[PDB]
Design a protein around this ligand. Sequence first.
Ligand code: FES
Ligand code: FES
Lengths: 121, 121
Amino acid sequence: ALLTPGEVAKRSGVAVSALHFYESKGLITSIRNSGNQRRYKRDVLRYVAIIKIAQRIGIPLATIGEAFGVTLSAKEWKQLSSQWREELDRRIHTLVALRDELDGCIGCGCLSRSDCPLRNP
Amino acid sequence: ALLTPGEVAKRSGVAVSALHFYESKGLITSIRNSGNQRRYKRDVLRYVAIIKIAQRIGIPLATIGEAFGVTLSAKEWKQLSSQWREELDRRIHTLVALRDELDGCIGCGCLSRSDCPLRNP
DNA sequence: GCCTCAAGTTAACTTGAGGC
DNA sequence: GCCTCAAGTTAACTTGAGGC
Ligand code: FES
Ligand code: FES
């Protein structure tokens, strides 16, 4: 059967307004019933779930749509997951570089413009 | 001598509007000259520099003020730097946990609510 | 409850109008 | 150039008004 906006909201843990928004930003799809009311394809649950994991990764909605294209496969998941495991990685290396630079500069405090890592990344 | 808003903007690499804002959010201080124009205590350069390093760490302005109290020592720097090297750390561990959880779920794609890490953090 | 659409919210600022 | 203050900008939504 098709899910009503309300249901999807409970099983997703997102506001119905959140679903309206995601659809307007084209991250989920709808179908209108005999009374213009939206009805969702179970699949939506998986997407929303993915939207949230993507958010945790620190990925912006626009980009999450930019990855969604415009019906969810096994390949797709592998395409996304990896594409994110990568950023999650780059991002981490970036933060780690900092932590190293930072540890050196703790006994310093000079913050030399032309000579300190922390300042000239 | 005292620095003019313009100078401080060039040596900081921030908009004069940025300096106005930081001061209003109480992260830097000013002194008005005979014509109500602001004049800065060189020290401001170090703060701004710190505001930016704090931002890189991923710290919010409010919090950066929350750490600044309301005249910059050696102890202060150690108080801040550490206090940030810590968050920079917690944050990293969080991202790393994800990356691990994520790697397991790549050959899966089940996204079992009551059974997958990625979903129930 | 569900639908629409306008406007408000936080963050970190920027842009613009008005005036010296 | 610098000063003030009101309003605009992006992001991710939420709140509210109005109507079925
Ligand atoms: S604190 Fe001196 S080089 Fe970074
Ligand atoms: S992808 Fe199946 S448990 Fe996470």
